[model samples]
Target: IAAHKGVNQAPVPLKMERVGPHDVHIEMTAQITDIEIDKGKIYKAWTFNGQAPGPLVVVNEGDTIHFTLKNMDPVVPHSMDFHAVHASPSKDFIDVMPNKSGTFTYPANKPGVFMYHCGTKPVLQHIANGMHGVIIVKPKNGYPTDKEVDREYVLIQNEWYKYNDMNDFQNGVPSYVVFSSKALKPGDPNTNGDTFTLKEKPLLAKVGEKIRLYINNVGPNEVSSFHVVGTVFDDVYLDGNPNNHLQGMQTVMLPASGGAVVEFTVTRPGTYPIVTHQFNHAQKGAVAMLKVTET
Candidate 1:
C-alpha cells in the first residue's frame, strides 16, 4: 500500500512557542484525511494538527503546557490525551466532539520524554491512522551541560496498513494493509519487501561527548525494543521521566504511545544499526543506522 495523489498532503505543521518561563503554547489543527503509506498507495487518513506525529513540544520541569486543539474536520471530532500529564480528569481521556474545539492545561512537572495522541474510540485504529506526537520536559536544572554534544535527534516509530477505508481496514477485511505478523520475518527480503524504509541516520557527535536520543513510539499496533549495537546508553529516562536515577541498559522497551530519553558517551567511532529488537521489524523497514564521526 502506498500514498495516492491528493492524499499525500493533508497534515498541517504546528506552531509551538514558549509563552513564558514555565509555559509553552501549541497551536494546530487535527483532521481526518488520506495519506500515502508507501510511494503511490493511498490509505484513509489520520493526523495531529495535520502532520504525522504532529509537532515537537519542548518544555522544562515545573512549566505549564497550554495545549489548544482545533478540529478542522467536520466529519470527525478530535481530542488529545497526553501520557506524561497527570491531569485531574486525566488528559489521556479528553475528547472533543465533532466540529468542536478543546483545551488542555497541565503542568510539565515531569522531566523526560512523553507522548500524546488522539483519545478517540477504536484507539488502536486512531493511532494507526496517524495521530501522535512527542513532548520533551527538561529537568529543573536542565539537561547536562557538561558534555560537548554536537547534535540531537528524535525518532518516532509507527506502523501502516494499505486499506482505503478505515472501517474495512480495522475489521481485518484486508482491502490493503501492512501489519506485523509472526510468519512475516523482519529481514526476509520477500516478506519485508515493502518499499518503506523508516530509518534515519544518527546525528554526529564528538568522541568522549554525551549524546541525547529522544525515542517515541506511535504504533497502530507494534511494540518496540530499541537497541544500539556496539555501544550502550549510559542513562535512560523511562516513559520520559527519570526512573529514580540513571541506569545503564542495552535495549529499552517501548510500548505503544510511550517514549524514552537515552544518553550515551561516545568512546568509540563507527556505523551501527539502531533497531527494534522485534527482529522482523529490524529486517523489514524498522532499522536505521547511526554514523559516528571522529573529531
Candidate 2:
C-alpha cells in the first residue's frame, strides 16, 4: 500500500461548547483532500476540516447558533446547510466562494439529531464526495430516561463511491456504506469484522448500563434500518426528539439526512453487532459493534 494522506479515523468526539447558557458558536472549513475508503483505497473527498462525516456539533435545545463557513478549497465554492437550524437556505446556507468565508446565525428551536451538509449546487456530488455531518440539538430538559444512560455515543452513517462516479451514485450503488469511522476488514482481528474501532479504540460499555446512541444517516442517496444484534431499543426517539418516541423498537428506520436516538440496556456482557438492517449496505461495510463488559 502506498502512503497517502488520510483523514483521521478517530471517532468524532461528543465534547461540546457553549459561549453562553443559551448560545453556541461553530466554525468549520471546507477543503478537498484525500481519504481512505478502505485499507489502501484512497480517494479525493470534499470535506469539513478535512474529515469525512465532518465534526460533531452539540447544543442545547432553544440555543442560538452562530456558524461560520470558511471555503478553503482552491477549486470550488462551498456552503453549509444545517437541518437543525430554522433559517432560509437561500440567505443563510448560500455558498462561499473559494478562499472566502461566510457567517450566519439561527435558532436551534427544535430538539433533535439533525444532518448538516454542503448545499452547494450538485449537492449529491458534494455529499457523496464527503461533505456532510451531524448537529445534535439535545432537548433542553433532557430525555425522560437520561438519568439511566450510562453511555452516550454519536454515530453518523454515510456512503462512499469512487471519486467522480456519478453513474454509480445514480444507480444507488455504493463502494461502501459505513459508520462515520471507516471501512472495515471483514476478517481483521483488530475489528473482528464487527467492532467499530477508532484507532483500535472499541466502543465499550458495562453490562446492565443503558446505552444511548445518537445516530445520524447522512446518505447522499440511501436509507437505513439501524439495528442492534443483542438487545432491542427500549426507547427509540425518532429524529432524536423526545416527542417522537417509540417503545420497544427492534430497529429504527432513517431516511437520508435523518437521525434517531436509541436507548437500550445491556443485559449480558458480550459483543453486540450494530448494523444497518439493509444487509446489502451492511455487507458493503456498514457494520459495527458494542462490547459490553461485566462489571
Candidate 3:
C-alpha cells in the first residue's frame, strides 16, 4: 500500500461562477478526524471540510447549488445527496440531526460527473464513513475554452477500509487500498513477483504535453478498472461527457459512482502505472503513477 509519499490531493478544484450564474454557495462541514490513512495507518475519518475526498462541487449546466450542511458530529446523523440533483428528495434529502445545520437548493440542470453522498442513515455506512465527494456538471458550452491539455489532472478512483478496531463504529477490511490521489497508498494487484511498497509519486508529465484526466469513482465498495500504463485514450469522455468522444480507449470502465474524461498524448517518455486492472484491485491500493519527461 502507498499513502506515504506525502500530501497527494489534486482533483477537487471547482469554480463555476458567472455572477449572472446562480449559486454554488457550498459551506459543507462535518468533521471527525484521526487522519493518516497510509502505511502508518491512523484513520478515524468522517470528514468533508476536514477532507476525505469531499469538496469540489463545480456546477453550471443550469447553475444553483446552495448546499450548506454543517453537522459538527457530536454523536451521529448527517445528510446530503446529489447525484446531480432532483432537488426535493423529500425536501432536499433531509436529516442532519446531531448538532444540526442544513440548507438546500438544487438545480444543475444536468451535464455529467456526479456523486455526492452521505444521505445519512447507514447509507452504506455513510459512504463507508468518509462521506463522498465529486460533482462536476459543465456543459452548456462551458469548460472547454479550446481545451487541449498541458496539465490537467483529477484522477480519483477510491476505496480505503480498516478501522474495525475490533468493534467501534465503522466496519470492514480494506487495510490500505489507495489512490485517493496519492499519499495514501495501498495495493497488491496480485504481485506474484512480490515487491509491494508503492510510495506513490509520479504524474510529472511533459513529453509532448496533453494529459487531461478527470476520472472519478468514489466507490464505497469497488470497481474501477481504469487503466493507463503507457498511453491510449486519445479521447474518451464517457460520462463526464464533453460531447461523449470515445476512441481508441485502453481501459476506463469505472463504476460505483462512476465518471470519465481521459485524453492522453505522451508520445514518448516512460513510467505510467495508474492501475486498477482489478488485478486484485491493482494490488490493493489500486496503484498510481505517470512520470514522463523530456521537454
Candidate 4:
C-alpha cells in the first residue's frame, strides 16, 4: 500500500467498494509520534495511521466491518474500541502488543456518527493522548430527508490538550485547547506553529437546496453546542437516527463522543460560521464556515 500522510493530518477520502453487499474492510495502524500539532508546539502523541484523529470509516447499516488494527508503537499496547460497533470489547478490542497487530469483525447495526478510540487501561489518557477517530454508518435506506440538499459534509469536533510540562499532562491539566485544528486560514503560507486549515473547505451550495451536516464530537471532555450562527436547523437527528428526530431546532446538544445529523438552508449567500455556543472554542480554532454562493 501507499505511505500514509504526514503528522497532524486527518485520514479521510479513503476509497472503498462493497466486497459482498455486507462487508467493509478497514486497515489501521498505530504509532507513537512527536509532531507539531500547533505551530512551534510539538505534542507527544499516540496516533492511528500517522494522524491525531485517525482515519474515518464510513459504511452502511447492516454491513460487517472487517477491522485490522496494527500496533506499530514501540513502547505500549493498544486496542480499538469503536462506539459504532456492537460487540464485546474484550474480544473485538483485541490488545495489540507493540509492533504487532490485531483484527476483529463486527456488524454495523445502527446508523449514526460514532467515535472510535483506544480502549487501553488508562481510557481518558488514551483518548486525551490523541488516539481517536470517526466512523459513520448510513441508514440502510439512506438519510431520511426529502428536502434534498446541494451539498453534504461531515465535521468532527475535537479538542487538543497541551501541558506546560509532562507533569501537568500526566496530571490531566491542559495549558490550552483547540477544536479540530490550530488557528490559521487557508491561502496564507507565511504561518507560524501548526497553522489551521479547514478540515474540508467551507460548505458550498446553491441558493435553494438544503445543506446537511453529520457532526461528531470525540471530546475527551466538554460538550458541544453545535450551531450555525445565521441559520436555524431545519431538522435534526439527535444521534443521527431518523426515528428520534426534531425540527426547527435552535441548537443541538452533542456530548463528548456523541454525534448528530443536522439540516439547514440559507436563503441568501454569505459566509456563515459553524461554531460551538461556548464561543471561546471558535476563537481557539473549533470553527468552520459555510460559503453558500454560486459555487
Candidate 5:
C-alpha cells in the first residue's frame, strides 16, 4: 500500500463519557486501510474505525458497557475480546461476519487498563495486524493518587511485521516495535511513523506535575519493561488496577497483552526518554519522550 496521507498518530483524547449513571456505550467499525508503520513505510492494516490500535474506551468500574462492533471488511470476520470483561467468550465474544454488526453488553466489573482485540480464529494474525486497543475501567472510587495527577495520557505498544510475513511474525521478528497505534499526522516531524516517540512528538507536562500514563503492551509477542529516564515512578498500579497497586518502582514489567498505570512527578524540566527496558525493542522503536517544562 502506498503511504497514507494525513495520518494522525497522536493518541486520541481520553475523556469521560457515560450514557447513564451506570452505563456506557462504545461503537467501532472494523475495516481495511493503509497505515504507516515507519517513516514513509506503509502497511495495509486491518483496523478498527479505520485506525490501527483502535480507539480508547474509558469507563468506571461497575458500569455496564453496551459495546458494538461493525465489521466492514468485505471478506474477513472480526470480533471483540475484552480482557476487562468477565464473560463467556464462546457466546459473548463470537465473530461478526463481514458487512455485519453485533452488540454485546457486559459489566466493566474490573478496574484496569485492559487490552481489547479481535478474537476471530487465528488470533495472532488478527492482533498482529492492528486490531488491538485499550479499555480502561477507572476504579469505582478512583485511585487515591488521582488527586495528585496533573497530566494523563494513554500509550499502547505494538509491532509491525516487515511485510505481514507469517513466518517472521511467528518467529517473533517484527520490523518495528513502537508506541501509539496511530500513524504519523500532517505537520508532525518527518521522522518514523511512530508519532508517540522521541523529540518529534513527545508526551508533554510541566515540572512538578504528576503525570499518569495508562500504558499497555498490545504485543501479539513482546514483553515490556515500561520505564522513563530521569524520574522514578512513585506509584504503579499493576495492570492499571488500584487493587494491584505498587510504590517506588523504577520499571514495571508487562507480558504481551498486559498493562499498568504508572505515575511519576516531574522533578525538573527536560526531555525524559520513555522506553521499554528491553533495549532491543527500544532500538527497534519502542521509545517515546516526556517533555516536561518549567511552570
Candidate 6:
C-alpha cells in the first residue's frame, strides 16, 4: 500500500483480501532502507511491507486475521508480534529469521485499539527505526459511524534524536537515543526541544457536531498525558479500543508505545489547545490548536 525509499528496489506490492466472510488475509514484505534525518545525513531504516509501520490492517471483531510475512531484505531477519493478540509464551509466533518467512493467525476477540511491533531483540532499536503501527478491530455490532466530519486525521506522537551521521548509530542504542526524555527541559524556547511542537495552529471543527481523534504515542520512552482545552470528549477509546461506548472524558493517558481514540461533540466555537499534560511537552512543541466554527 505504501513504500519507503531505501528498502525496495522497486515498488513493493502489498495485498489484503477478505476470506470466508469472517477473516482477512494480509500479504507483505519488510526491508531495511535508508533515509535522511537531517540535510545530507542519512541513516539506515527498517520498514514493514516496504513502508515504515506497514499498512493499516482494519478488520471486524470476531474476524480471523491470517498474515503472511516475507523478509525480503536478505541482510536482516524480520518478524511481527501483535500486541492485540494474546501471546502467552513470549516466544509464541515471534521472530521470522532473516531471508525467511512465516504465517500466523490471530482471532479478533476484542474490539479496541491495539499495537503491533517488531519483537526482535534490541527491541528499542527496531521501534526507533520506525517499525510499528496501530490495528483496529471494529466490534461486530460496530460503533456508531458519524457522517458529520469532512476529514479524518491520525496523529501519532514520537520522539527522535537527530544524529549528524550514521557513525553515531554505532555508539548508541536506537531506543535510548530516540526515546529519552532528556529532551524535556525547562525554560527552553523550543519547549525542551524534545517533541515536535506545531509552529502553527491546526484547523478547527464546527459546533454541535463530533470529531473523531485517533491519538497514538509512538514514543520509544516518554509517557504522554493527552488533553484538549475548552472541550472534553464524549468518549475515549483507550489503547485504540472503544470501551463501553464513548464516555465523557477530558484527558487521557498513553504510556510509551501506547495509543487512544477520543470522539467529542464540538458544542462551542473557540481555539482549543491539544497538549500533553506533561508541562514540558506543552512548553517544547507538543502543543497544537484546533478551531471550532458555528454549525
Best candidate, TM-score: 5
Give TM-scores for every candidate, taking all chains together and pairing residue i with residue i: 0.77, 0.88, 0.35, 0.83, 0.88, 0.71
Summarize candidate 4's per-residue lDDT along 232-282 as a digit string, tens digits.
999898778778789998889889888888999888877788887877666
Which ranges in model 1 have alpha carbons more than 4 Å from their true place?
Answer: 1-10, 33-35, 88-93, 97-100, 143-150, 162-202, 206-209, 266-269
Model 3 residue-pair collision total: 16
lDDT of 3 by residue, 111-215 (tens): 877878888766777676577877777788744623777766665665666552323334554554455442111231111001133334555677887887766
Q: Which stretches of candidate 2 lie over 4 Å from their true place?
A: 1-17, 181-200
Clashing pairs in 4: 38-194, 39-193, 39-194, 40-193
Candidate 3 wrong stretches, greater than 4 Å: 1-60, 63-80, 83-90, 94-106, 109-114, 122-124, 129-135, 150-154, 163-174, 179-209, 215-267, 274-286, 289-295
Off by over 4 Å in 5: 1-17, 181-198
RMSD of each: 7.4, 5.4, 14.7, 5.7, 4.6, 8.2
Give the 10-residue window scoring lowest on summed lDDT in candidate 6: 176-185
The Cα RMSD of model 1 versus the native structure comes to 7.4
Between candidates 2 and 3, name the one with more favorable TM-score.
2
lDDT tens string, model 5, 20-80?
A: 9988877778777777777777777777776667777777889888888877777789999
Better of 4 and 5 by TM-score: 5
lDDT of each: 0.63, 0.79, 0.66, 0.70, 0.79, 0.59
Model 2 is weakest, by summed lDDT over 10 consecutive residues, at 186-195
Shift in Å, residue 176, candidate 3: 2.3
Tens-place lDDT digits, model 6, residues 114-178:
66777676676666665666566666664555454443445555544333223433354332211
